[PDB]
């Protein structure tokens, strides 16, 4: 999705920035520009000018509260962002060939707990989807254009579980139905879905959320959706498993055997909570 190019929010905090102080841009970089790159540059450029030791870089994304900030120092907050679309805006970016034409909304996610931590347990994890609206729109005459409005949305931890599941259900879905196939990308997605070794695995998600049928049916429209997303997930793992059996040679036969074994072990456990 860098047919569109790479976009970061940039906030300028400090009197030493002259007219930039309390202004906030969305920068447009070339495609696949990495967070290291821009942050090297903006610190490098205000290093050369104010002195290396006053350029402090806000390695954050929570909105800047003006107080906590040493007023002597020059603070730059940098956050990667993605172009944000209507469901109507998006649909038309499917069917007509030119798609880079009204980029004025940009989205970032920042994770939290009520605790004031960034990350928590599966049931403690919150996410704030923020939508930035810029004054003018890309593509534009300048490469940065500043932010005029801002919208925050909050996802209850179960809504967060859903977005995690949906993205990886689709990551499988894509790595399966694609020509010519990519076996390494497919096994990479597949193993990290059914045969996880490091993170929490998808089972613990069903367990933490799908174990009790909630009363409050405003929360039921959540419980159900996660229940159905596991159904689509478990259908896309099969398909992917099947498809990897085609693509492998002899060396990866024990590999696939374990990936298979890992799956039925999981669908086993899943089935109580899904049905």
């Amino acid at each position: 999705e860098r047919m569109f190019g790479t976009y970061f929010r940039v906030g300028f905090y400090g009197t030493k920035f002259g007219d930039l102080d309390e202004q906030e841009f969305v920068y447009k970089e070339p495609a696949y520009t990495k967070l290291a790159e821009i942050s090297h540059r903006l610190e490098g450029f205000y290093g050369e000018r104010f002195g290396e030791d006053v350029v402090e870089v806000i390695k954050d994304s929570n909105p800047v509260d003006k107080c906590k900030l040493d007023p002597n120092k020059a603070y730059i907050q940098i956050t990667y962002v993605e172009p944000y679309f209507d469901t109507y805006e998006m649909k038309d970016r499917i069917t007509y060939f030119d798609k880079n034409y009204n980029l004025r909304r940009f989205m970032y996610c920042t994770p939290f707990t009520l605790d004031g931590r960034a990350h928590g347990e599966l049931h403690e994890q919150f996410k704030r989807k923020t939508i930035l609206t810029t004054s003018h729109a890309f593509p534009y005459i300048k490469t940065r254009v500043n932010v005029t409005h801002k919208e925050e949305i909050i996802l209850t931890p179960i809504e967060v579980a859903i977005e995690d599941m949906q993205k990886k259900t689709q990551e499988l879905a894509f790595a399966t139905h694609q020509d010519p196939a990519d076996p390494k990308m497919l096994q990479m997605v597949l193993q990290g879905s059914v045969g996880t070794t490091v993170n929490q695995g998808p089972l613990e998600v069903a367990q933490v959320f799908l174990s009790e049928i909630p009363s409050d049916p405003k929360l039921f429209r959540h419980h159900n959706k996660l229940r159905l997303c596991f159904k689509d997930f478990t259908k896309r793992c099969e398909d992917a498993l099947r498809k990897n059996k085609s693509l492998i040679g002899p060396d990866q036969k024990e590999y696939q055997r374990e990936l298979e074994r890992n799956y039925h072990r999981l669908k086993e456990a899943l089935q109580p909570l899904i049905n």
Binding site: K34, S61, M185, T197, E204, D251
Partner: protein, 178 residues
């Protein structure tokens, strides 16, 4: 061409995963949206051409000694990882990790990645480890370890100050193309 299989091995709590998820998502280690699944994909540009790098994340526990080398076949390049302020983990590079990937994959290139290098030049951890008779790993004492071990080279980075982060992955791709 196609995806590059890069398998990443090393002790848990060198923050091996912490940096995989943060480079690939363009996030600081404080703001990445955490997940439950494993492995991460990323497109790096290199000489104007864009290569995609499949990042295979592996538990550093003994408990997985039996299962882990199942990912090793068809690997293109290895990132062997240690934290420069965890000399337990830099010993497990000589005598666990590099032997393991070179036993199943003798012709496959690997890299030495030091990580968490911000805590090296950090006052509170230096004498914290010295207060059990240990100094962090200087790049000197790691650069030779990699020449000793016929690694492609040594690289070190910080997930947090992003320093040398891009270099780690540029070299991994490059090493896969030779």
């Amino acid at each position: 061409m196609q995806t590059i299989k890069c398998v990443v091995v090393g002790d848990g709590a060198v923050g091996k995963t912490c940096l995989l998820i943060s480079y690939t998502t363009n996030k600081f280690p404080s703001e990445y949206v955490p997940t439950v699944f494993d492995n991460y994909a990323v497109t790096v540009m290199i000489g104007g051409e864009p290569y995609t790098l499949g990042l295979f994340d592996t538990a550093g526990q003994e408990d997985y000694d039996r299962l882990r080398p199942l990912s090793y076949p068809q690997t293109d390049v290895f990132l062997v990882c240690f934290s420069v302020v965890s000399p337990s983990s830099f010993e497990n590079v000589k005598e666990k990790w590099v032997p393991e990937i070179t036993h199943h994959c003798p012709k496959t290139p690997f890299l030495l990645v030091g990580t968490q290098i911000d805590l090296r030049d950090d006052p509170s951890t230096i004498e914290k480890l010295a207060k059990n008779k240990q100094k962090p790993i200087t790049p000197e004492t790691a650069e030779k370890l990699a020449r000793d071990l016929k690694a492609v080279k040594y690289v070190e980075c910080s997930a947090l100050t992003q320093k040398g982060l891009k270099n780690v992955f540029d070299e991994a791709i490059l090493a896969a193309l030779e």
